[PDB]
């Protein structure tokens, strides 16, 4: 999961 | 006065859905790449096409290019269309999203479709969907226990997350919000009133959590989406004749 | 997954509805009096009381006082309540409203009710209703051709879209509160609340400035705007 | 009518  | 009144969606065409897909950025901005954004792009194309939209997509446009494309679309006639959809998949903060090379204030884009600027969409839903971060807060988990028209009317602004917060993206599956939006569009898009559908999306996204993270403090963090309605009628996407 | 899921509204109490009612302002803010605002206050009091709310009003509080009162309310238990409603009737611009003496950013008020700050409202609707200007644009008329996020379950109901003037009749009250109250009276106890707010959007969008000292403002318009972070259908069936 |  990555942060936008 | 009829509580059940729906927008008339009986035009020749459903309308255009634009997707601005931003995966990489000019190096000086030092923005991380958005692996998985292409899954979102494809997912949206499938689900909106299935609802009759003419989907157009653009990858990594610079601000000048993006602005030109958006101006062009706000200039063409939408007279024989039911509505207009515009999707941004990118980084963001405050009230702006990023093009390849610079930020653009979201109001700069929506303003071009206000009633006085775009006569052919007057009375028609103007739907903007934004998958992007909106600030640097990371939400924490909790547990329970006849008439004229305003030029600003009939917009629906659909954000992946509430104001001020990080939004989440899976590197292969795509963003939390676009996945859940597309799942709901696939099952319910052709029957359910669209704000009801967005509400289901709020619930779906609110159920997710950061299950694993290199930063242990981020484990279990959350996200609630947020949509703003200036719609004046019920909105459906029944299959067109 | 139930597409028809509704919030549980079967607690002992409906909940509190706060109304912050601002008619006059510290002289140096150079803000005009808001005649018609006590009409809004009384109208809302009646409609929300009818829906079961415990209505509490505060008139012309200074910022410090207002903040104290809101903190107090966010601190008391809402365990036995269905939801919480908070209304502001005032001047505003940008992202703030005015207390008697100073502006307050709306986020300052709402933040006190986020899930980590108010545990007893977690999973319950937190509804904010704001009758106030939001900028200096006057809209013109046109014609057609699991855990939970701490930010969840807010509903922000604005009398007008971002950046615009909002309108108030000196006797009948604001356009938005009149139409909201009319819709609460007819449909509050039956229709889903966002569905009802959409009706309000349509009602307000039909109004126009019929007469004005400033000829350029005749026929000007207003569309309200609500933002939902709700996760379920919201109804106010009789308790 | 007045402006808020
Ligand atoms: C940029 As996509 C595949
Ligand atoms: C995928 As698009 C044109
Ligand atoms: C949210 As993990 C890096
Ligand atoms: C406040 As959000 C759309
Ligand atoms: C004076 As009061 C309504
Ligand atoms: C008017 As008070 C409750
Ligand atoms: C709107 As008239 C003074
Ligand atoms: C954008 As308005 C709530
Ligand atoms: Mg956890």
Author numbering:
A (entry chain B), D (entry chain D): 1 to 4
B (entry chain A): 31 to 175, 197 to 292
C (entry chain C): 31 to 175, 198 to 291
Published text:
We present two cases of protein structures determined by As-SAD phasing in our laboratory during the last two years, a putative PncA from Streptococcus mutans and caspase-6 from Homo sapiens. The crystallization conditions of both proteins contained cacodylate buffer, which specifically modified surface cysteines of the proteins. Both datasets were collected on SR facilities at the wavelength of 1.000 Å, the high-energy end from the K absorption edge of As (∼ 1.04 Å), and sufficient anomalous signals for SAD phasing were obtained. Our current studies demonstrated that cacodylate buffer is an effective reagent to covalently modify protein surface cysteines, and that As could serve as an ideal anomalous scatterer in SAD phasing method.
In the case of Casp6, proteins were prepared with DTT to avoid the formation of disulfide bond between free cysteines. When protein solution containing DTT was mixed with the crystallization reservoir, cacodylic acid was spontaneously reduced to a chemically more active As (III)-thiolate intermediate. The As (III) reagent in turn reacted with cysteines by a thiol exchange process, resulting in the formation of a cacodyl-cysteine product. In this case, four out of ten cysteines in the protein covalently bound to As, while the other six cysteines were either solvent inaccessible or occupied by the inhibitor Ac-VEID-CHO in the active site.
